[PDB]
């Protein structure tokens, strides 16, 4: 409980204060990482900082008389050349590179040691996966499932000069708002846990393992929620997952009286005078975060982004027009029926949300 | 100087920790030190102690009271003297 | 006497005066090798108040201008008086 508690003072002491960005805080900290770290003379004006590791290797390029990053170049020993660590932007002939975006664009090293911390967990853990392949092709691979599936969701990798592949949905002004993140983090809880490489197969329509013998011991798949942030938590109930694939439960810990707004709106008489509202709730509703979607769990990906879209459309907007000062409202698990006027599941599609939260606003107002 | 010597220490503190502590002890006495002479710097000088806000303009006030009664009398005097 | 009074009024004094009591009590948990992070946060929240008041000092400049606008009313007085 030592070292543990040392690791999370460690971590806490990196993240509060990440330095600024000078040649000498970025070479302490690859050092820090385990990196490899040498600086070459390129010129009179032109110093290189290159850092290594078993296949990463980058090279920081810093202008001596304008104390700034010129550029920042990731090469991998691997067979796989193609890793991308480009900003994915719509319309932008140029690829902004994340590495050097996180030593220009920011104020502190919080997001280069994030990118880093990132790029080490792929090059310690990969091997005979190469997990610098795998993380590239699986943004395909989802791609695909979506298309297959009929989900109306976007893949884009590396969004706003950090590392993952990030899930879009269309927002009501057409904007694109990210609804989940997807990458690797080390599995804390199991040294020993086998992630496996597994694809979407075009042809069986389904995730396959191909190569059973391919594996990387202590990493997991994480997906994140991205909460647009207690009115806009995404909850679930919870017999939704099984326990064993939540990451991060918000223990709502015990000296706050946060339930669920949607629960505290059960117990509180401050509704529209023109809705009783019904609970027909069987589980409890609990504040989830990170799934572990590693390995046969790649399915859940679909059904847990459906809940989170189900959730944000109909679940937190009833909510929000309920709560804003005699027809019945009955909310459950996947339907919500306001009396025979209207009704909505969770395996309806999103224009059948839209119109129901539309009429439903038509009667509140 | 011990404002940048303060922050450099403060982060390989933050930075390395495991490092044995015989480091650890050092660098803690020369942060110790930075600051004693930091506190004497502020001893010794009276005018940074009263550096380290309504009282401005309230002799901005009194300034431009002032200048402006003296214009108002030298008018006075320019248009008497004149006969 | 009065000049320690006028010292303690204004808040950058305070402000190196808990920073310093931050920092003793950090150099106390490093010697009973027992790092809290509450006295590192606090030690770096304070260090940033300080530097905060340190760029609200600098706009200093205007009473220096009051001042010398002073010794030109003063001037100005002791003029028109030998006149």
Same mark, same amino acid.
């Given at each position: 409980s030592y070292v543990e508690t040392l690791d999370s003072m460690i971590e806490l002491f990196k993240d509060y204060k990440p330095g600024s960005i000078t040649l000498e805080n970025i070479t302490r900290l690859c050092q820090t990482l385990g990196l490899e770290s040498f600086t070459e003379e390129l010129s009179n004006e032109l110093s290189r900082l290159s850092t290594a590791s078993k296949i990463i290797v980058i090279d920081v390029d810093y202008n001596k008389k304008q104390d700034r990053i010129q550029d920042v170049k990731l090469v991998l020993?691997? /067979?796989?050349?193609?890793?991308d660590y480009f900003n994915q932007r719509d319309g932008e002939h140029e690829k902004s590179n994340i590495l050097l975006n996180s030593l220009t664009? !920011?104020?502190?090293l919080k997001a280069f040691h994030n990118n880093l911390k990132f790029l080490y967990l792929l090059d310690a853990y990969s091997?005979?996966?190469?997990l610098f392949k795998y993380f590239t092709e699986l943004s395909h691979y989802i791609r695909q499932c979506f298309q297959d599936n009929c989900c109306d969701f976007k893949v884009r990798t590396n969004l706003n000069d950090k590392f993952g592949i990030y899930i879009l949905t269309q927002g009501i002004n057409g904007k694109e708002v990210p609804l989940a993140k997807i990458y690797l983090e080390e599995n804390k809880s199991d040294s020993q846990y086998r992630f496996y490489e597994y694809i979407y197969s075009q042809e069986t329509k389904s995730w396959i393992n191909?190569?059973?013998e391919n594996f990387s011991n202590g990493i997991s798949l994480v997906m994140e929620i991205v909460a647009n942030a207690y009115t806009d938590l995404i909850w679930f109930p919870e017999?939704? &997952?099984?326990?064993?694939? &939540? &990451?991060?439960?918000?223990?709502?810990?015990? /000296?706050?009286?946060?339930?669920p707004p949607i629960i505290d709106l059960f117990s509180? /008489?401050? !509704?529209?005078?023109?809705i009783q509202l019904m609970n027909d709730f069987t589980t409890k509703l609990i504040n989830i975060k990170?799934?572990? &979607?590693?390995n046969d769990n790649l399915d859940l990906i679909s059904e847990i982004l459906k809940w989170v879209q189900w959730s944000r459309i109909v679940l937190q907007n009833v909510f929000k027009l309920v709560s804003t000062p005699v027809l019945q409202l009955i909310v459950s698990e996947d339907h919500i029926i306001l009396d025979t006027i209207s009704e909505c599941n969770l395996y309806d599609d999103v224009k059948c949300w839209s119109k129901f939260i539309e009429k439903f606003q038509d009667i509140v107002s | 100087e011990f404002i940048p010597h303060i922050f450099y220490s403060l982060h390989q503190i933050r930075k390395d920790p495991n490092n044995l502590s015989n480091q650890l002890e050092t660098l803690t006495g020369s942060i110790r030190h930075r600051l004693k002479l930091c506190k004497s710097l502020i001893s010794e000088n009276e005018d940074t102690k009263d550096l380290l806000p309504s009282e401005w303009q309230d002799i901005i006030h009194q300034r431009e009271q002032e200048l402006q009664i003296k214009r108002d009398v030298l008018d006075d005097l320019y248009r008497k003297l004149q006969r | 006497t009065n000049s320690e009074d006028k010292l303690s009024k204004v808040q950058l004094y305070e402000d190196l005066c808990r920073y310093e009591d931050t920092l003793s009590k950090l150099v106390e948990s490093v010697d009973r090798f027992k790092p809290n992070l509450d006295i590192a946060k606090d030690l770096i929240r304070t260090d940033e108040a300080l530097f905060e008041n340190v760029k609200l000092l600098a706009e200093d400049n205007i009473y220096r201008n009051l001042q010398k606008i002073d010794k030109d009313s003063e001037e100005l007085d002791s003029k028109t008086r030998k006149i």
């Amino acid at each position: 409980s030592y070292v543990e508690t040392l690791d999370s003072m460690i971590e806490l002491f990196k993240d509060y204060k990440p330095g600024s960005i000078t040649l000498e805080n970025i070479t302490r900290l690859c050092q820090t990482l385990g990196l490899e770290s040498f600086t070459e003379e390129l010129s009179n004006e032109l110093s290189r900082l290159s850092t290594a590791s078993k296949i990463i290797v980058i090279d920081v390029d810093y202008n001596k008389k304008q104390d700034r990053i010129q550029d920042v170049k990731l090469v991998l020993a691997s /067979n796989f050349d193609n890793f991308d660590y480009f900003n994915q932007r719509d319309g932008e002939h140029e690829k902004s590179n994340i590495l050097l975006n996180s030593l220009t664009k !920011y104020p502190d090293l919080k997001a280069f040691h994030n990118n880093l911390k990132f790029l080490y967990l792929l090059d310690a853990y990969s091997h005979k996966l190469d997990l610098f392949k795998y993380f590239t092709e699986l943004s395909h691979y989802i791609r695909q499932c979506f298309q297959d599936n009929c989900c109306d969701f976007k893949v884009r990798t590396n969004l706003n000069d950090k590392f993952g592949i990030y899930i879009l949905t269309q927002g009501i002004n057409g904007k694109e708002v990210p609804l989940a993140k997807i990458y690797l983090e080390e599995n804390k809880s199991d040294s020993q846990y086998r992630f496996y490489e597994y694809i979407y197969s075009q042809e069986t329509k389904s995730w396959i393992n191909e190569s059973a013998e391919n594996f990387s011991n202590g990493i997991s798949l994480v997906m994140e929620i991205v909460a647009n942030a207690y009115t806009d938590l995404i909850w679930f109930p919870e017999d939704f &997952i099984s326990p064993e694939l &939540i &990451i991060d439960k918000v223990t709502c810990s015990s /000296n706050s009286s946060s339930s669920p707004p949607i629960i505290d709106l059960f117990s509180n /008489n401050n !509704y529209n005078s023109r809705i009783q509202l019904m609970n027909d709730f069987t589980t409890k509703l609990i504040n989830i975060k990170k799934f572990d &979607i590693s390995n046969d769990n790649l399915d859940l990906i679909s059904e847990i982004l459906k809940w989170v879209q189900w959730s944000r459309i109909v679940l937190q907007n009833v909510f929000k027009l309920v709560s804003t000062p005699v027809l019945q409202l009955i909310v459950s698990e996947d339907h919500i029926i306001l009396d025979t006027i209207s009704e909505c599941n969770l395996y309806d599609d999103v224009k059948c949300w839209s119109k129901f939260i539309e009429k439903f606003q038509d009667i509140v107002s | 100087e011990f404002i940048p010597h303060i922050f450099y220490s403060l982060h390989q503190i933050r930075k390395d920790p495991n490092n044995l502590s015989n480091q650890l002890e050092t660098l803690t006495g020369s942060i110790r030190h930075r600051l004693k002479l930091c506190k004497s710097l502020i001893s010794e000088n009276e005018d940074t102690k009263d550096l380290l806000p309504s009282e401005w303009q309230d002799i901005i006030h009194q300034r431009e009271q002032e200048l402006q009664i003296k214009r108002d009398v030298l008018d006075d005097l320019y248009r008497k003297l004149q006969r | 006497t009065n000049s320690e009074d006028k010292l303690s009024k204004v808040q950058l004094y305070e402000d190196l005066c808990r920073y310093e009591d931050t920092l003793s009590k950090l150099v106390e948990s490093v010697d009973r090798f027992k790092p809290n992070l509450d006295i590192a946060k606090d030690l770096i929240r304070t260090d940033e108040a300080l530097f905060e008041n340190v760029k609200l000092l600098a706009e200093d400049n205007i009473y220096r201008n009051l001042q010398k606008i002073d010794k030109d009313s003063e001037e100005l007085d002791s003029k028109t008086r030998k006149i």
